[PDB]
Amino acid sequence: YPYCRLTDQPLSVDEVLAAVSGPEQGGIVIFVGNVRDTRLFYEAYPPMVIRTLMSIIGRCEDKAEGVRVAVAHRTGELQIGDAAVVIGASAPHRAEAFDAARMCIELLKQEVPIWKKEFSS
């Protein structure tokens, strides 16, 4: 199965990178979505979100041969500098890894149902 995580813990670039690596993957694209410049919370129902993430991964891998996609999304409280999402896509060639990573994040942004809360301490 693909690497597909929804967690309250800091995301791992190492893990996403490893999930997507392999002898035949010449190109790897990794997207990191960081929190920019006050408290921030992500609230989600994990079963629904994870299912949605799996759907997205399947559609992205479907575009070209040898394409591997991994996704990690964070929930809970976040700080400036924290990764909210980490996406990895690999392919024999760089074009297909760029295509899959970009497709993955656009779909995620459009589809993953999430509540965003902002208040001030």
- 31 binding a copy of itself? (CB under 8 A): yes
- 18 binding a copy of itself? (CB under 8 A): no
The strand ranges marked E within the chain are: 4-7, 27-34, 39-43, 68-74, 76-78, 83-91, 115-119
Q: Which is nearer to a copy of itself, 45 or 77 (CB)?
A: 77
Q: CA dist 7 to 1, 28, 35, 46, Å?
A: 17, 23, 16, 9
- The reply, when asked if residue 118 is annotated as ligand binding, is yes
State in angstroms the smallest separation of the CB of 86 from a copy of itself: 9
Collapsed DSSP state (helix, strand, coil) of residue 60: helix
- 113 binding a copy of itself? (CB under 8 A): no
- 29 binding a copy of itself? (CB under 8 A): yes
Question: Residues forming the annotated binding site for substrate?
Answer: 34-36, 93-94, 109, 116-118
